[PDB]
Design a protein around this nucleic acid. Sequence first.
RNA 1: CUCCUGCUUAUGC
RNA 2: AGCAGUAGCAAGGAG
Lengths: 705, 249, 511
Amino acid sequence: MEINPYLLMLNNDITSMISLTYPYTGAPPMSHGTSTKYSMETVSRTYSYSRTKKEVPSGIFPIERRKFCNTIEDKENLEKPNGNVDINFMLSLAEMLEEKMGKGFFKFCANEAEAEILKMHFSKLTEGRQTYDWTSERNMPAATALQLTVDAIQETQGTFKGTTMVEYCNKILEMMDWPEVKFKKVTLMITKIGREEFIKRICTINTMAKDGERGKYKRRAIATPGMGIRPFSKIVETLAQKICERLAESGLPVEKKAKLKTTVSSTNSKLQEGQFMVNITGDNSKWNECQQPEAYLAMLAYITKDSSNLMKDLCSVAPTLFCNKYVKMGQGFRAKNKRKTKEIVIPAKKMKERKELMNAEWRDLFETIEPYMDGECCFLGGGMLMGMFNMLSTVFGVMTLNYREERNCYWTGLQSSDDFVLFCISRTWPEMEMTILKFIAVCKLMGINMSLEKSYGCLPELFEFTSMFFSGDFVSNIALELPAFTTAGMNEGTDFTAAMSVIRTNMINNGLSPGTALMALRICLQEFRATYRVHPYDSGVKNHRMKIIRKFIETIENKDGLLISDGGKLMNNISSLHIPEEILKEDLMDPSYRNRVFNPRNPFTQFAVVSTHSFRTRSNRTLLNTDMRAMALEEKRYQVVCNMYRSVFESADVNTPIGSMSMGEAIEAKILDRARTQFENGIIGGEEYSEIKRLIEDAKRQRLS
Amino acid sequence: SLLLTLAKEYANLTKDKKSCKLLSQGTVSSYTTFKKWTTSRKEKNPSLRMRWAMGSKFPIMANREILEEAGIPEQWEGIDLWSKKDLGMVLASPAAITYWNFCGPGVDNSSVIKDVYKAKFMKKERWRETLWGPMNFELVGKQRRVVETQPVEIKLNQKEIKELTMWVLFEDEANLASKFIQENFSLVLSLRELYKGKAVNKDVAAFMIAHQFSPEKRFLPTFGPIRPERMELLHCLGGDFWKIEAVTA
Amino acid sequence: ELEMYKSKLFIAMRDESVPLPYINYEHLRTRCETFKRNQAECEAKVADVASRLKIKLEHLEENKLRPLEIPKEKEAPYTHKFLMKDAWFFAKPHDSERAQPQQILYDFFEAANMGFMTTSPKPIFGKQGLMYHSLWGQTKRAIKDKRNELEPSEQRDFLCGIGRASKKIQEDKWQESREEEFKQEETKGAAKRGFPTWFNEEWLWAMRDSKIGDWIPMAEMPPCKNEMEDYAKKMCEELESKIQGTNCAREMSKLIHTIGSLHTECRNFPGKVKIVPIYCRGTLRGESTDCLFGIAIKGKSHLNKDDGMYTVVTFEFSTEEPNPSKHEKYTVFEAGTVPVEAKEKKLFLYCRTTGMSKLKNDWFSKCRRCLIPTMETVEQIVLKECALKEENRVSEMLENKRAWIAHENGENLTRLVSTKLKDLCRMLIVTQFYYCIYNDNQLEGFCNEQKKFLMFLQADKDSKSAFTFNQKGLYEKIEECIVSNPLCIFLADRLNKLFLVAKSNGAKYFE
RNA sequence: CUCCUGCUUAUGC
RNA sequence: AGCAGUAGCAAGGAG
């Protein structure tokens, strides 16, 4: 007898039998080795889609520059994807777009955007993902790379007194005018660097391999920018964020289910006696190699035509930094002999000298990228990689979906980052061929390539949008990640309640039927118990922590009031996922047990749930033996100074401590201010006030010298 | 007498040579980017390193002088609780945690704990005194709304709360004087008669003030009535294919 | 306030990165501020329509949804790390004091008599016989002396790789020679195999009930109010009464205990080779017992990164004759005789060297989370039914409802086996377990493309007249990621048989 | 191919 | 050998 797990779909829908076809349960694919070939494939594949050879020599950069707009060599293979944008075509689509809703659309959205730019502090730049620090040329978090950048500013020329967005951006543009920039290398020496190398270094974007992406056979290279591009990209993402929040044919901020009900219900009431509707799920392929930032310079030059003078020049810089970006090419490759015994390492620097030690595919990809190579990097001027403008290309999708050609046959739909759903209304099937080929015509002219392999359509709603397969009546949910249930791992108290918070937030947002919640709650309970070696008292487990609990169980009177971390049973349920375990169990505890556990005089916690099991695990051992020990001394000094500033201002972690004078001067003026206020209504004694005054004056002469 | 201690600490930290180039060179806001110097990348496997931590014999950093006052070096059969390897901080085992939880001293602090967490004990008191009924088994579904989800009686909008905690706890560097003060300053006259003498720290006080004054408004799928009292009962009352509600009062 | 810092190099940089019909940014800004559209836009649009040559492909007239190309090559071997169907265990009552894995190993050294575990130095088949014989004797006298640390000999220096690594020389000294040590690089890819025929018997065995009872370590049930919780509780209890007794439960308990033990041994002792049993724990006639399926040997894992792929040497216990097609990677010896009461059958010891990883230890060791997606799915079915009838019919619905699975081998057209709905979850938990084992790139791409063909079959079920733009490149993308995964080739074959069964009613397919 | 070098006690309702 | 898949791991150093 054979067996087939797919036969349930003979008498079901694709809204129940679609979670069976996700392998979201097993190990994700990781990358191994270098990520150079992926960068060569992305950059060389970008130049292959440029459809031109029109090169322009450069005076700033020592490398040639190829244009990407209005220079087309029309091949016969037009079904192959192109990377060429006609600017008058897309500006005609912009003028056709603003004539659909309102008159002062871009002025209103731009005045809201500039209304939110001027009330922004640059510490929002520290609330981001990992960035590229060019001081040691590594990948660092945002606060560390920003602090090394400000360290380079205050070390190079003068100090920094900005504390705003615009003065920090003007500080970076001031750094572009400096003839020499001094910073620190590693044991903390001070080095210097010129002017053109600072231009080559400020526009350097690091590429690596995307780890943990479910759904691809071949891997892909993701890119992380530096620090001098991030605030301008924040400006453009706020402008396009307000444009996408104001429009009604987009789904990025999120409801994504009501909009499709309003356009399916609304556009089915716009039919004649013979017309009908066919929807098509598409998937735009090669989306990160066909969006050139020069069209962003044209449209962002068109939106801010009447906004201000600051915004008109402030929203025209991040495309100019995207038109000349460098690409880190990984770290090279490895060679070996015939016996496969000795294996040398060739980095990305000496790849030009060691050119004759490569394969056929490496030389085919390398000879098509050679007249654009720097020593370490590559010069890309038409790509838009991952980790960049996402709310701006969706506006181009809305510009494609609002085309008006003058019958009564047209289209509408919904747009995402690279997923569109298109609704077509026409009368006959060759007219359907005319309208669909007009949609591929307008997308092909504007610069959006639909994939012909991953696209289909039907007459009623049986479409696909962001992995939610919508049938004729019902809605399937997003198959959520199973590892998100247990990712706290910090405490015996902030694991089970955090897991109940994850079950609650996955219950409200997604479907997450109750037996799945009780099963996931009980499995996360078992992984908590197996992780922290704590078992129930009636079990037969005998380890080094259940001997004490089994020995001292006779002192506890009420046995079901003990914590789960101390050998108790389960009392939380689905209707108690907002109440923690301790607060639920404190109505039944013994007074010796409750007064014993919750004692703040404990050797573990001393030096959001109740802190009574909160301990700190020990640190590593190889963190003080490498060459980066003095950096741990620097974070030690940072925590000392932060403990000092916490010791001066008794309420500093609640409000954002703005100010632009100094830290120690507000400390000294604060101790003098509270010394006078607590002096005249308080102290009154000559030796204490004269002694504190003597320590402030001696500390001021010590600090100033 | 605390200003003499702060004078000894501030005079102590200016004695260092390379630390004088740290302060009085930056800005007040740079304290925020002085707070974060997390040189680790992401801590991408927290539970994995936690299970690797709990598998050893002494994973915990514990204080010495508190645990030596009442603790015992070894338990009644070979259970190790102590080390002599290294600030004076001693590694330890979680058997000392459960041994402290079963064979340790006790300090009566039920009033403080039952006064810090008044919102969550209010959630338990409102949860225990409700009644349910039968189910319905019907199709249900509605759009997403922005709902204040806590039964507060003040209803501030996340702007008078930070400013309120500035003008109650520590007024020496609080805020510029706005027009949002007056009746909330009568509320300051009410609040200073409460938080004047307590053993509660000002961070814990600023924590517990912000949970009785802030209606937590989120963007959630709601259906039926939009009363806030049944908004912690949101995930329990109905899902997508089922619904249960018979609440009389 | 409204003044941006007009620098010198940036104003030379912005004017350089303009489009080609423009000179400076000033001319482009004055043209974009004075732009009005025209009706030559439709001339370029239709001029783009004419030079296209693109037609859509219907399905009611050109139903070219052909079956997929399964490779007609050598059969794919059994590539799972342990043994599923050919396993044999020795049982003993479990002692509560003797609970560490080395103490279980010692108590099974006196329990399962290794003095009768004599091996001949000539195996039945395989590659290396003397190294596994000396390694098995060395670990047998190692367990005999009650210490789990293999002394360094040439057998362990050959099997678990010590010194088998290339000399990574940086580009600081290279000492070039004329036409000597001519070095380069070369990649190959992955080898292609054929359809596995052994997968059906392990599927049908994996959902068959085993008399040892509960295998999986679940936890206690919380107390219940008069709410819907009873319902959820009821569902859990009923589903638990199906999944504790199957053999997939035994394999999951095997991976949890064995791989958790190897995981803690990989943390506590790098650089030292340990001896770890391969065992379970289950209730036999109420008595809590533990099993013993094999002997695993670590390979001095220095796990620096998430990768590393350390070497595990596995000695397994079997009681069936081997097969050079299925058991291709094994090195089957003969062990002896076992009395099996219903007379005294044979005993075959298997040998296999393999590798694990640190990133495939947390997803294998923590694989108790395969009861979300099966319970998730079953509750979606039941809640759709009660959502369509508006009446509390759940307990009688889990008994009076069929589910079509498992067509026979000689015929397929409308010859299906309808089972009960409460049994169905058995089969469901099986596939979720396999999704943890055979997860590769090929299973990911194959699951995307099979979601596409599921959308086509749903378009067939309601007669919606779907269409496609390019069928050649579609099958050039699906057939690319079907190379050597046994689960991918198997589910491709069952997708073709799904098209054969669905062809008898709806007309969009072939034979 | 030849030769020199290491500590970390792990307990599934 | 082996894991694995478009490239790495399978201790390091010297001759």
